[PDB]
Amino acid sequence: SLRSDLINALYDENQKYDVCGIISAEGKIYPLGSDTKVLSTIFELFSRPIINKIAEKHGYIVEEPKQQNHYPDFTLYKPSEPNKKIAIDIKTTYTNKENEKIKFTLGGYTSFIRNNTKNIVYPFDQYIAHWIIGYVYTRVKTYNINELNEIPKPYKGVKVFLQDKWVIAGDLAGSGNTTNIGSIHAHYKDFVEGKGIFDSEDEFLDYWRNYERTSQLRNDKYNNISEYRNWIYRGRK
Amino acid sequence: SLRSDLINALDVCGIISAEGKIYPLGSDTKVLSTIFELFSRPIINKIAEKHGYIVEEPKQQNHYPDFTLYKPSEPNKKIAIDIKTTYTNKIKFTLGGYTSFIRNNTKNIVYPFDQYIAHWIIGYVYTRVSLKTYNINELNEIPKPYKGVKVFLQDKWVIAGDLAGSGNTTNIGSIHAHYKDFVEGKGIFDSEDEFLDYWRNYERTSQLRNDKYNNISEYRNWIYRGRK
């Protein structure tokens, strides 16, 4: 399927290559640093061609944002069906020891999920799927092309997975002032297998559309999945 | 000097795999920020060596500055260098938080704020204009996500404005002007002392700033008032 093939291509290309730097028209090569700002940029760029090709095999079109700060990284769809869109977002995080617990920031919880047309390419309801391509990496002179093998890398053991956002979503925020949804805090395996805490995508969306911004307000409402469900049981009170 | 030299030392089109496949750039700003920083590190390190200065980047991620230069002899004469980028279709940059290291000497900074003697800003300005990969010899067919790019070096305090560069992330806003004013260093502050005092007492929201000051005129009237 579009999805099986997408995961297949990503895992293959990744388990194969390694980006080692940026290159100028003149042929000079600048190495990379081990900050997630760099690696994020790198991993997003490394994925766009693959996404494009797979999207093409399945007759989908691929569109990116025209203005920045608008979700998602890639919007796929078929013209003959402009309402069943797929949202693909590439998220990155790191690890020092291999197979350690990781967590991702999964997007704002006061934007497009609350206001159908807020900071999003297309109105929220036009998408039927929200996929996250997560990358996990381990943190470890200009150059000539003929040197492409000696340039050192600021990363190791790069792992990647694709999973539906709601599935790997957690019940705790990923950020404070930037009010981001936090993912589950787990091993790479649970992400692949989709061992999340929500039962449905409606449960996911409800919990975050009502999540209070601060622990003080949440202390009155709910601070976690257990209290959310109790909150529901009582009649949202 | 170290400064004129770097000024003097001062067309990337993709990332490359050790294999040799060239992955293009996205026409965005988070991309170019990363690009421009990577492009700068070599230049800075080459010039730094010339002057017997050590270059240290951060270990922790949310730690200013991008680069710390210094002679192993004079460890309290450190220089802070930070790369900032903006785009053109007058411009403005975000110049760093005004609630961190400028109010708390050792907060989110590689070395205690008191050990730095200069805070330089290397600014890049680009004019914003392929989902295929390419090969080394195809470099001439890859579409660029930017039409032009200007760069400048300047002291942080000289190009600082009186309005915040961001709300929830509380950044210092630069002056809102032409590239030439940046290079000219046509600021609004009279000194680095005034720049620091203005941003040290800045309130986060407008309502709180409403009974203090929200611009340079107001700050000056507030000082005369006896800082209240």
Place this chain on the structure above:
DNA sequence: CGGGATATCCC
């Protein structure tokens, strides 16, 4: 854990 840092932009 949650608040708030890192950089830059938009309604």
Place this chain on the structure above:
DNA sequence: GGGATATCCC
């Protein structure tokens, strides 16, 4: 001018 975009830190 407040709050979006991505991810991290203690």
